[PDB]
Amino acid sequence: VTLCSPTEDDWPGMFLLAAASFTDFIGPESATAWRTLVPTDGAVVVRDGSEVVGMALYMDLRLTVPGEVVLPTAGLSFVAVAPTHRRRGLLRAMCAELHRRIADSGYPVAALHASEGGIYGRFGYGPATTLHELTVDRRFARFHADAPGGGLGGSSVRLVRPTEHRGEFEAIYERWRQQVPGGLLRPQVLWDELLAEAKAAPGGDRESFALLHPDGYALYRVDRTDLKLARVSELRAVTADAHCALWRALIGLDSMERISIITHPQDPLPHLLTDTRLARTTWRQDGLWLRIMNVPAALEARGYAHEVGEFSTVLEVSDGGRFALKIGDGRARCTPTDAAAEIEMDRDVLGSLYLGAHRASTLAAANRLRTKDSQLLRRLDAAFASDVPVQTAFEF
Amino acid sequence: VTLCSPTEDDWPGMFLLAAASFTDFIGPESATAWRTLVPTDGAVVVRDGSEVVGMALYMDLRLTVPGEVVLPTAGLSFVAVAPTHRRRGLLRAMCAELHRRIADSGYPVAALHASEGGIYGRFGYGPATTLHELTVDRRFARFHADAPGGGLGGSSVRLVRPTEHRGEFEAIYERWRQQVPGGLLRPQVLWDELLAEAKAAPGGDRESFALLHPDGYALYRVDRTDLKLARVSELRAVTADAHCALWRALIGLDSMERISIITHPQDPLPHLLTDTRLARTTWRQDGLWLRIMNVPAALEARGYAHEVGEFSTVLEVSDGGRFALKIGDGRARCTPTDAAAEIEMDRDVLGSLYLGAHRASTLAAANRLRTKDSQLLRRLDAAFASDVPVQTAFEF
Amino acid sequence: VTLCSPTEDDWPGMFLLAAASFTDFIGPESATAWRTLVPTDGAVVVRDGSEVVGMALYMDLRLTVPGEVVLPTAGLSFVAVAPTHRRRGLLRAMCAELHRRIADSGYPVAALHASEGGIYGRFGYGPATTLHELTVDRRFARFHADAPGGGLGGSSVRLVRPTEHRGEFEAIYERWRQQVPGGLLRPQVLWDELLAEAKAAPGGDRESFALLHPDGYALYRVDRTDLKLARVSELRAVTADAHCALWRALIGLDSMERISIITHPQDPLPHLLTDTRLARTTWRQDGLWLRIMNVPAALEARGYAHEVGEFSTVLEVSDGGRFALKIGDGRARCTPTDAAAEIEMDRDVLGSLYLGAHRASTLAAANRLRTKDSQLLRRLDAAFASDVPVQTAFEF
Amino acid sequence: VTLCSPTEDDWPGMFLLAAASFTDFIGPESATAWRTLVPTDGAVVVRDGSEVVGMALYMDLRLTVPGEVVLPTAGLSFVAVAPTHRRRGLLRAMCAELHRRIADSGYPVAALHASEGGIYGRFGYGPATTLHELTVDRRFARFHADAPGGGLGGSSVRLVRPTEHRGEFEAIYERWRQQVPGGLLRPQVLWDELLAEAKAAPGGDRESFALLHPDGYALYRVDRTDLKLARVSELRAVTADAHCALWRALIGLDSMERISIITHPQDPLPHLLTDTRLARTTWRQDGLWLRIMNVPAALEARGYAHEVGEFSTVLEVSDGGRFALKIGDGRARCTPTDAAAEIEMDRDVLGSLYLGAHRASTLAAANRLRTKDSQLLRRLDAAFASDVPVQTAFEF
């Protein structure tokens, strides 16, 4: 078993392992499009002696972080060990080689979506965003008197074919992803992919429809089996007006009993209704995972809450360096020190704080984050918090 | 139909309406104990002409709010209109009379638990705490290396009969409720009630067991039907050590597949495990609802985040007054003004901000909270936030 | 209603009855391939007066029996009476004609798979093999210290496309079926059929994958609806090493919760795991049914346990002859006699003993098998037992 | 943590651990009856420093083995570690002490029923009997022409109150348990227990009824929730006539859709019906587990198949001795040797062969049983087989 960069010869064997490893795999033509986002030397395979028994790669991504700052981000994906080669340390070996290449290429952060929740903590990945499923029983749903877009006249939302308004969805998504922590740039090939899956599959998913507002869209389809359930695959709104208007149109699907959506914990939808309970949380899971590749580079790059006053401390990342951390005026300076640490945490914990999804207080309570000063806990909580709520762009 | 304070003669008719209205009603002897928490003139009934077709009451409660401050709180409960007298405005009439008595008695706040989520917003109640059900698949659950109480030697947790350690549960609960926003004083009669329900019911619930630590306890029982599920009815821990230790003992129930608990969104349990996902959120609902009876009294009484700098604004509560609000040094001054409002909200929205469970940003996004200054939104968010996470004491 | 051999004209009407009668019917092109295994005069139809209201046929098969002996076997199949012509004795008539042709052609045995368990006993068919479904919860599955192929180095199992290793599957299956009681020769057209069904169906079954060892293979696919379940459609191993190795690879499908397989009661898989219970029996049914067409020919043809000592008796088959049966040195001589019978049984009971799947003791307990000597019961039990466990080849 | 024999003071603390550990626990009065079967020094507890955090005991039992031989048997039971004291090696310590006392007392075998299937292999226990649940859809069930007790006249089965025919059930059970491998003597206190559970529980199980034949009985009750299902809790028949007659009466419960029973793999019921499939196997699990305490004593004590001819070999039990094993004339001699081993197996594997439930062939296939001679495998298979099928007496 040797570890090396795949040649053209290796990709058919990688697609075989992919088909056997991943239940959501479409096939070679779709995989060949995703391939365009993998840089030269962004992929490792393990051959036996002969066929591919291990693979991993990263894609070049652009991640928005608090302060509307966009970081070049190594998006780890397509990771698979053959069922014939478990417990052979092939994951540990492939992750080590990719982290070396990612670090040497000058990415400040790596990111992934996790298939299981127990694999990636030990490689320094922390869960950094939270997914909420909301299911609305739309038969009882009335909008509050205070809810926007209640006034008379015409609706600003149109029902449209997704495929005929690509440009408008692209423009809205582009505005969205530059303003929101968790935001990813979506390149042409992933819009090609998204609109191909909006079309009806023979004995698969149904036709997708779009609701289009000047400042927002929602793609939705009726579920395969439950014909009384509408699944919102994507809702992107730049203004509160856009968000309320699209939910007025979705609650107006009078043939449906339930509207379901994967959203974020701070989604204001519950507050648009006279009965907050009608928007039930049916499901909740980690979204994006972060590995901080370079601590000073990452901590300096994001914005911090202007509210908390200037403060200084010493952060120790376990096997990741000790740093003098000065936060003030929503900026951070992070410099090498050998001064006694006031805060210790593993690198995964740092990933989990980085986008504001987790409070330092909560991780301290679980002893993932050690400190003898609770005034310092309060200050980190307040500083790392995000004014714009953190969201999840698309799975990769 | 007349509205008046019940006489001794009226209570048997109130117990009848209770039995028909509430599915969790035990009977007269249990109701007579709860009665001891209702003050003179704390109850209204509506008679037809003859029998009781409407009732409502409040109990004298002590609610802990951010800053470890304890407020006298009118706990609204036992509210019921006969099925024969719907849509007759009997709720509106009974709530109006109780709010008059509550206000004139000098309670700064009223609270309730809601049977439906759509009734109480219009009477000025806002949902102020959030309940999370976590279900742990304990067969996969391993504690993190960082998790407290991993070291060798003996366990500090004991398995005990609940009924033999009343005093220890009382002491721990008393410490807990003085330190935690949402905390209620539990009087003797509600401990009498709690331990009566820890005993096995013929063809009802099973024997309850306790795990006891110097600084925490957990009451639990196996479910009636699912003999592989343990339901934690109550877990109260004062220190992180206590909380981790009790979860070590609960994960040690090796005959169970699942441990379920109603907890709060900031519960650190997910972070004690190598796999955060093993602690799935199965259910999420509003807990305690607040009506701010007196705005200046309530806003002045709680503590605020020391982190945010001194700032001033004008809050307008819809049909509730306009106030000059100055927050600095974790204290507030709230005084009458006729100056132009910078923030408007209905009284229910204020209830929802009061314990820190909801961000002003989120309610602004739903237009429940109007302001033309987003720097002011950020400052309110930061000021009203609680350093100790808000929790739910007991249902009433 | 007349009974006769179909002409070319009749097959479209037979395919119509097939489509209406059998839920697993693919269509004419697939049926035309199976047709190649039906000899001249191996099919009967019943016409009304006009259209086909009844059909039955046998295929030329080669069945392995204990002692690695291969018998020419009439495989009864494609049996159907129109829903318009029930209770008209059309099955009794068609079975009578086919048994006449099968007997006159010189087949010692007939076999079938039964749609219902209550039809074929009365025509002399006995259930002769047993199917067990095992479902492994592979998340808990650890192999025993004693289990083969635990040692270091590389795996001998490869993950492959089924369609690219036809020759290797053919060779392994050929070795398997010559060594195992219940084994059937699989001709070219049934391998053509098997690999056509390994490909993904639009809105049907998913891609099939193969695990290939020098001495064994497993074909498997993820279930249509349960994406956490892998269905092993076929596992054929010649050595214990092959069998353990393939189960190591299947337990290594780390995206699956459950592996299901239709196997036989003596499958050693439970014993490869530290927890035998993890391999739960979810389902158990009769497999192959046998009708002994010629008693002396069949009894003489199979091998017997060398362990039991030489013994003699007189077997009476009800309306099937009386025979002097001498068993010794793992061989039998079976000759006409009019001597008093020591054992009586119907012909179906004999079919059920023939491959060793059922103990004579058990059938005696149900009085399907009469004898006044229990020493003789013990001797038959021991003699008819098979050293290699009896298995089921493929459905037909 | 110290290990010692409990005093009278310790039993209330043991009942507490029992209530918390075992979901089927009735209470002190029932436990005090079972206690009468525990000999002096048959129980160990582990105290912390104070309360009971560990317990285990054995009961004096009489186990019937092949050849109708009755062995004094240590029945291990009531084993529990507190949830506060897992992974402290308390089970390993308690099992070690009990095995010492059991061995020194002169029991040739120990037995238990396992709560999980993965705990007891490592302490030398092998699963030695198999439980089958059969569910009969009795609406389709017709008895075969060959089935006993079909003839005219009166039924020999009576429907009776269990409590009024204790003596008749006792006599039948006594005959049953002396003739059947797996049979246990049931003392007075366990008949007291059995008839107490035949009475209807307020909001628990329903009235139990008995079917009584001179040579057999069946206790049954309708299920709590499924009022169309009858659960046969116990069926004990000495003759085939008794067994068929009781099944005629059970199929005659014309208000029921389904009859369910926990029986053994060789139960002849399927063969009494025209449709064998109507008796579906819904569930299958290990019953009794055996630890051979003394190999020569146990191997010499049971009978062997008279059919197989005299043969000699050398058995090595892993860390349990090497023995010259001579089997002939259904008897065994087992003597110390240092001659090269021809068969190796762990002590648990031996337990699994001992009552005839598992074939040596099957365990050899899983490499739980090593031998270079397959003629020797065939001979062990044949020798250890039981003429009377192995059954499970009662859980303990």
Ligand SMILES: O=C(C[n+]1ccn2cccc2c1-c1ccc(F)cc1)c1ccc(F)cc1
């Ligand atoms: O992202 C993928 C994985 N992938 C590959 C092929 N695919 C077909 C249908 C879908 C996929 C997916 C997929 C990904 C995320 C998701 F949420 C759903 C599907 C990829 C990356 C680099 C490559 F070179 C090739 C593929």
Ligand SMILES: O=C(C[n+]1ccn2cccc2c1-c1ccc(F)cc1)c1ccc(F)cc1
């Ligand atoms: O709180 C109650 C209602 N109540 C009354 C009787 N009860 C019997 C069993 C339970 C109750 C409950 C109950 C409350 C909350 C809960 F979560 C469960 C039960 C009350 C208040 C003032 C009174 F004068 C009489 C009763």
Ligand SMILES: O=C(C[n+]1ccn2cccc2c1-c1ccc(F)cc1)c1ccc(F)cc1
């Ligand atoms: O065996 C068949 C029946 N048959 C016919 C057509 N088919 C299409 C798909 C499948 C079939 C099956 C089938 C059989 C067994 C099974 F397990 C699944 C399918 C046959 C025999 C002789 C003929 F002349 C024509 C057909």
Ligand SMILES: O=C(C[n+]1ccn2cccc2c1-c1ccc(F)cc1)c1ccc(F)cc1
């Ligand atoms: O066997 C028991 C366990 N036990 C104890 C108490 N119990 C109440 C109801 C049932 C029990 C059971 C029980 C056992 C097996 C079963 F299948 C169901 C219940 C025992 C042995 C020695 C003792 F000193 C005390 C108890």
